[PDB]
Design a protein around this ligand. Sequence first.
Ligand SMILES: Nc1nc2c(ncn2[C@H]2C[C@H](O)[C@@H](COP(=O)(O)OP(=O)(O)CP(=O)(O)O)O2)c(=O)[nH]1
Ligand SMILES: [Mg+2]
Ligand code: NA
Ligand code: NA
Ligand code: NA
Length: 326
Amino acid sequence: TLNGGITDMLTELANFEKNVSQAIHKYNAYRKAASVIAKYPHKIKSGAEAKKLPGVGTKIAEKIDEFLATGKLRKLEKIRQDDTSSSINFLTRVSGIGPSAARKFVDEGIKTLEDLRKNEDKLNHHQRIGLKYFGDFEKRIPREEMLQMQDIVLNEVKKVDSEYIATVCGSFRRGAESSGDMDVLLTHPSFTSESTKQPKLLHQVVEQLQKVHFITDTLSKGETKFMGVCQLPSKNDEKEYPHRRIDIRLIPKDQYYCGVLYFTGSDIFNKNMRAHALEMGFTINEYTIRPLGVTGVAGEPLPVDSEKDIFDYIQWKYREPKDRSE
DNA sequence: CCGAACAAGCATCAGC
DNA sequence: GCTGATGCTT
DNA sequence: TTCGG
Ligand SMILES: Nc1nc2c(ncn2[C@H]2C[C@H](O)[C@@H](COP(=O)(O)OP(=O)(O)CP(=O)(O)O)O2)c(=O)[nH]1
Ligand SMILES: [Mg+2]
Ligand code: NA
Ligand code: NA
Ligand code: NA
């Protein structure tokens, strides 16, 4: 982390614009600048040097000059003193509380963890589970625990139907030594873009992971996307493990490669890659890559038989997952 | 200067 | 009930 | 907030 102080500042600015100002484009600009700087392999010595990188403009360059001179940013230090800003920023750390709900809660004088706990009745289901596991959800998962969880998920899925294929994506698939949560891509040959030949494909997997007490709570759940909570089992008399966020995405079997590209990320990598696709005349979602016609209307899905096929279409060199951690 | 900035599933709510 | 917008999330 | 045209 050559430039950890700079990228921390930019990330804190990003979070302020998202949570407090509700300025999504400023938030993306700071995150993008933080991303391009994190992979820059020199210790930055001036805002001018940083402004040579794409995504760092005049305003971020000036902030880097102030940071490098003083070790601080006056704008952030004032933001940190403001009670409303600090409280809104804090409340958004609860899963299910966003900028709108956080500002609504602070308006009614709900502005601390203890305030949240005594007003459970004012939370929706998702928010209540995010409050319940607030402490756990801020801990990272050592890859060794990710490996144990993987083994549980893949084996339980196989007991439901040997034709399911579960793939752990996210930062885990990118080779990270720790992960924020577990991301599972799921396919079944009964579910393709051409037909759904079995109902309850995702449900059966969820209920089986619940029966073996791996899934403990549900944040949201539909036919193709599950967002919930899981926990490794612990040995006799040992401390329990923290509860962990788990996301499961059922994707049409024939669209696996677009799906695993999507779910491997990173999120910024996906944004960069989809934006480049547009510049090249394609649009990419988790299902397909399609060309844009004369009027910018999406055309027919193109054939895809690997992740690299997608990179080829937009004329990017193939990047292994471990090189997508933007 | 100015328009564009990735794409979408689930929960919730207003309106009919 | 449905449609469509918005919030929040991946 | 940044960038391309
Ligand atoms: N097009 C897009 N795609 C996205 C987006 N947000 C998330 N994703 C995709 C890519 C993520 O890796 C994947 C998982 O989402 P997750 O939050 O778990 O990201 P990890 O890479 O695993 C970091 P960790 O803290 O969990 O370790 O979902 C998005 O806005 N736009
Ligand atoms: Mg993840
Ligand atoms: Na630049
Ligand atoms: Na939140
Ligand atoms: Na996730």
